[PDB]
Automatic annotation (TrEMBL), chain B:
Originating organism: Escherichia coli
Subcellular location: Cytoplasm
Function per UniProt: Couples transcription and DNA repair by recognizing RNA polymerase (RNAP) stalled at DNA lesions. Mediates ATP-dependent release of RNAP and its truncated transcript from the DNA, and recruitment of nucleotide excision repair machinery to the damaged site.
Superkingdom of origin: Bacteria
Similarity annotation: In the C-terminal section; belongs to the helicase family. RecG subfamily. In the N-terminal section; belongs to the UvrB family.
Protein name: Transcription-repair-coupling factor
Residues spanning the membrane: none
Length: 36, 50
């Protein structure tokens, strides 16, 4: 599948490339409903 | 703040660490109330206390 593993620093553009969104609020579960 | 924690947003009792309704749900409730109020001719609650 591949030949090598590359390790380097993470540019902010690369970090936004990994991301599928931006987290904005610090709450996880409604805890009354168990929904995210 | 964050020592005592902000109390429940839609109620009385400032400065409490309770796990009540969040900010996202509160804005939803407020806009739903705005729609249901502006819709059909519906007088104010406290006004009909008159």
């Amino acid at each position: 599948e591949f030949d090598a593993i590359k390790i380097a620093l993470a540019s902010p553009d690369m970090i936004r490339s990994w991301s599928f969104g931006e987290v904005k609020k610090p709450e996880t579960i409604n805890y009354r409903t168990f929904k995210p | 703040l964050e020592i005592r924690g902000a109390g429940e947003l839609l109620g009385e009792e400032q400065s409490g660490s309770m796990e009540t309704i969040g900010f996202s749900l509160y804005m939803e409730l407020l806009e739903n109330a705005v729609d249901a109020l502006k819709a059909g001719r519906e007088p104010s609650l406290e006004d009909l206390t008159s």
